[PDB]
Amino acid sequence: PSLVISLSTGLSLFLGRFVFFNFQRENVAKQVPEQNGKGTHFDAGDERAKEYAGLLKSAAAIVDVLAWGSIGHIVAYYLALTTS
Amino acid sequence: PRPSYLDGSAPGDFGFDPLRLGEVPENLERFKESELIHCRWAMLAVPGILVPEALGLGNWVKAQEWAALVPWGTLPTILVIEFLSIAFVEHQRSMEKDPEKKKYPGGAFDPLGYSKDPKKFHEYKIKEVKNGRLALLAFVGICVQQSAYPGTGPLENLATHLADPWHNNIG
Amino acid sequence: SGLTPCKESKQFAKREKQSIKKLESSLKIYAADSAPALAINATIEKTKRRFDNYAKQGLLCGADGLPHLIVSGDQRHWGEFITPGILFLYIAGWIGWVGRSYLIAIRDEKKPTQKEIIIDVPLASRLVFRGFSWPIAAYRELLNGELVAKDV
Amino acid sequence: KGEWLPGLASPGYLTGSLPGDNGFDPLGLAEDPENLRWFVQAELVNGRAMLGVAGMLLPEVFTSIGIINVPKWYDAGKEEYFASSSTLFVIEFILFHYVEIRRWQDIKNPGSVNQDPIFKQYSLPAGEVGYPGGIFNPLNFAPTLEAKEKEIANGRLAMLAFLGFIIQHNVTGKGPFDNLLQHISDPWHNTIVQT
Amino acid sequence: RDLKTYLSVAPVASTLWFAALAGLLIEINRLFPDALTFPF
Numbered sequence A: 001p002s003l004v005i006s007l008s009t010g011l012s013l014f015l016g017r018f019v020f021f022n023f024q025r026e027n028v029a030k031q032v033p034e035q036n037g038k039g040t041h042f043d044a045g046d047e048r049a050k051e052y053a054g055l056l057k058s059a060a061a062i063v064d065v066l067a068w069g070s071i072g073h074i075v076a077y078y079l080a081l082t083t084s
Numbered sequence B: 001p002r003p004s005y006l007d008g009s010a011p012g013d014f015g016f017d018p019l020r021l022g023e024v025p026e027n028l029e030r031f032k033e034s035e036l037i038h039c040r041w042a043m044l045a046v047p048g049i050l051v052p053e054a055l056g057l058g059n060w061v062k063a064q065e066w067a068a069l070v071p072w073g074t075l076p077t078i079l080v081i082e083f084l085s086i087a088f089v090e091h092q093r094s095m096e097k098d099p100e101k102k103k104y105p106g107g108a109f110d111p112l113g114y115s116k117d118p119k120k121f122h123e124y125k126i127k128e129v130k131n132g133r134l135a136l137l138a139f140v141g142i143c144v145q146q147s148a149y150p151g152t153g154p155l156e157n158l159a160t161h162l163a164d165p166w167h168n169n170i171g
Numbered sequence C: 001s002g003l004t005p006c007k008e009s010k011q012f013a014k015r016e017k018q019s020i021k022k023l024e025s026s027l028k029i030y031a032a033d034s035a036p037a038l039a040i041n042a043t044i045e046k047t048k049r050r051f052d053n054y055a056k057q058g059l060l061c062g063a064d065g066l067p068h069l070i071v072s073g074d075q076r077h078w079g080e081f082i083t084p085g086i087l088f089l090y091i092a093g094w095i096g097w098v099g100r101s102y103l104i105a106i107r108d109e110k111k112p113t114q115k116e117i118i119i120d121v122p123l124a125s126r127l128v129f130r131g132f133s134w135p136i137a138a139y140r141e142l143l144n145g146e147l148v149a150k151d152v
Numbered sequence D: 001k002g003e004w005l006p007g008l009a010s011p012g013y014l015t016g017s018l019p020g021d022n023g024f025d026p027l028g029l030a031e032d033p034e035n036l037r038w039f040v041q042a043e044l045v046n047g048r049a050m051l052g053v054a055g056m057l058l059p060e061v062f063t064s065i066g067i068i069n070v071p072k073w074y075d076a077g078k079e080e081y082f083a084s085s086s087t088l089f090v091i092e093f094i095l096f097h098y099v100e101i102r103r104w105q106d107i108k109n110p111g112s113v114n115q116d117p118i119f120k121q122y123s124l125p126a127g128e129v130g131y132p133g134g135i136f137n138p139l140n141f142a143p144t145l146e147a148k149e150k151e152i153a154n155g156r157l158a159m160l161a162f163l164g165f166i167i168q169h170n171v172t173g174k175g176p177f178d179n180l181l182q183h184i185s186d187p188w189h190n191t192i193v194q195t
Numbered sequence E: 001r002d003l004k005t006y007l008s009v010a011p012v013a014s015t016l017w018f019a020a021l022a023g024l025l026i027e028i029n030r031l032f033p034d035a036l037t038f039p040f
């Protein structure tokens, strides 16, 4: 059933948005993004990407959406496949 | 002798760190927090595995075989519940402001106010650890014993039955 | 260990008989009472004896009919490697410890290389037997079995 | 004190301060003082042989005429137990474990002379690593001084005595005492030379 | 006569040592030939 998919995709989105959102962002700050030299983008003219990252929402970008959901689907298929 | 950092004032501090694992300070505070939690889960559990055996349930192992084969009496159901919830709590507990609430959250977690007391709060602490370390040891004892797949209690019964049975071991 | 012991072996037993028949073939041209005679017969008894002993001590013998040694550490077959191995390391260390002890005693004063090409110093004062107890070099280890010049 | 050989002479490490000193260290193991203090302890603990060698000898000769019907020392593996063998090892191990480490500390820092669980009581009062007074010496004998050399010397013979026992057993296939008495069957023909 | 000794104390020492070692080993093999193991 498709329901398994949504429930899991659903929970994941919930988790990323509320439960785990702070931790994620926290690590990213202390981490990215490229070095040479230093900072990449200086040469290799590519390079964010600010708009899609822009989110009029109180937090969660779209990328996040794609990112959190995908994990959710994998899990769903994981379970759905597994029973059979 | 006594290691330099292990003063003795710390709750449960008897001078034991042979590999100098807590020589670095900011992680010694990390390990001290890690200890109680390991201690807290364990203490909760040993009674968990003994009383049911006492009432009669084929030990904690057979207790768990049901999933393998209301409300939510299904492994899938329970797993998500165990999952999403144990996640809500925890990775919230992280706070990392004043050593996980000084490692003693108190407040609502001390509905009966034993934290308010000055010296009792400290003696209460040293008691909590020692009991805890005791569990951790017990759990390991149970695990090693259960690794033969019979019973944590029944084991007692077997030895109690006779002092003659011998472990030998490798040994 | 698909091998079945040299006792209940038909190949290893057959191999014994094959070897002694060939030896027997040789004494037929010399006439007993002669020299080449005993030498052949003395060789035959040694042949029978070594085949006899190998079956006694165990020794598993493969399908080829020859004994295969087991070095797994199996208590049944310790004499095949561990016990001779312990004996080797003993002598191996003993030599190592005596040799090391020599070059050390030589270094202070004199012309050190003089003692190396010529050693009209025998065991120095009395250095050889010092090896009887080499393993006590473990206690030399806790102190200064190694020099601290390079690394640790 | 004395010298094991008239010539050759005692080493500097063998001052004579230690009881049982005879300048016998031809190889040189105990030359580093830290090395001695350890080998001094080992000699006493090994030496104290005595306990055992007498333990394997005397009961063998108490079963001489038929006073006691106990098995030989090399036949006492089973069933000399009301709890079976494998029970006993663990009990012997676990607790000996405890005594041995405590003894260990006194070699590095003396020490652990005090009682432990005991709620309100005394502790061992002593000095010297190898020999601790106290109930260890309830009589309160004389930690002298000569005995300390008596103690050793008797332990050293016992040691050699043990080495004798085990070897002799092999070959003489039986009891170190039957052994002893097979020699007495008018010796002068009953010698190790036989084997 | 100091001289002969030294003379015998050069690499010749090695030959004498290895001759003595060989003799020992061979004689051991005479008394105990075809030894594939230590059984005692």
Ligand code: CLA
Binding pocket: B134, B137, B138, B139, B140, B141, B142, B144, B145, B154, B155, B156, B158, B159, B166, B167
């Ligand atoms: C909570 C501590 C604890 C307790 C009360 C027990 C109790 C028991 N064990 Mg277990 N055990 C333990 C820890 C413990 N064990 C640990 C940590 C291990 C891993 C090494 C084991 C491995 C083990 C094996 C393989 C066996 C037992 C067996 C037994 C039973 C009797 C035979 C025996 O103990 O042999 C001796 C075992 C040991 C001496 C292991 C060391 C355990 C420590 C020293 C005991 C706890 C320390 C503490 C000071 C105890 C004071 C008492 C107090 C805690 C109540 C008895 C119920 C036997 C059994 O199954 O009988 C039916 C069995 O053969 N245990």
Ligand code: CLA
Binding pocket: C133, D004, D014, D018, D019, D020, D021, D022, D023, D024, D025, D029, D030, D036, D039, D040, D041, D042, D043, D044, D046, D047, D156, D157, D159, D160
């Ligand atoms: C554990 C046994 C033991 C130990 C630890 C010691 C230790 C010591 N002895 Mg003692 N000794 C012993 C047994 C022992 N002895 C026996 C049995 C005798 C009778 C000959 C003696 C006679 C003796 C004399 C006369 C003197 C000492 C002295 C000393 C001190 C300095 C030398 C030394 O470091 O010893 C080193 C420790 C060892 C070498 C232990 C290992 C020895 C090997 C491995 C054992 C050999 C086994 C055996 C030969 C196998 C069969 C051989 C084969 C040919 C049949 C030191 C405290 C000197 C002293 O001043 O006392 C304070 C002193 O002058 N000893």
Ligand code: CLA
Binding pocket: D051, D052, D053, D054, D055, D056, D059, D062, D067, D068, D070, D076, D080
């Ligand atoms: C230090 C090493 C050591 C030492 C010194 C001993 C010493 C001894 N062992 Mg022992 N043993 C050892 C290690 C050692 N063992 C080890 C490692 C093992 C493996 C467990 C054993 C296993 C073992 C067993 C199974 C036994 C011994 C026994 C004995 C005792 C033998 C004599 C006897 O029966 O009682 C001593 C003799 C007397 C007390 C005689 C006097 C009796 C009184 C006065 C009663 C009076 C009766 C009557 C009035 C007298 C008239 C009789 C007349 C008709 C002749 C003796 C004390 C035996 C034993 O336990 O003894 C009781 C025996 O059962 N051992």
Ligand SMILES: CC1=C(/C=C/C(C)=C/C=C/C(C)=C\C=C\C=C(C)\C=C\C=C(C)\C=C\C2=C(C)CCCC2(C)C)C(C)(C)CCC1
Binding pocket: C071, C072, C073, C082, C092, C093, C094, C095, C096, C097, C100, C137
């Ligand atoms: C058991 C066994 C086995 C195994 C083995 C092994 C695996 C082991 C090991 C090992 C190892 C891994 C070791 C190590 C090490 C190390 C080091 C670090 C070293 C050192 C050293 C030294 C220092 C020496 C010195 C000296 C001496 C003392 C003598 C002489 C010489 C000199 C002088 C050189 C097999 C099973 C195979 C076989 C059977 C038995």
Ligand SMILES: O=P(O)(O)OC[C@H](O)CO
Binding pocket: D153, D155, D156, D157, D158, D160
């Ligand atoms: O002083 P001794 O003559 O008793 O020598 C000791 C023996 O060699 C054995 O202890």
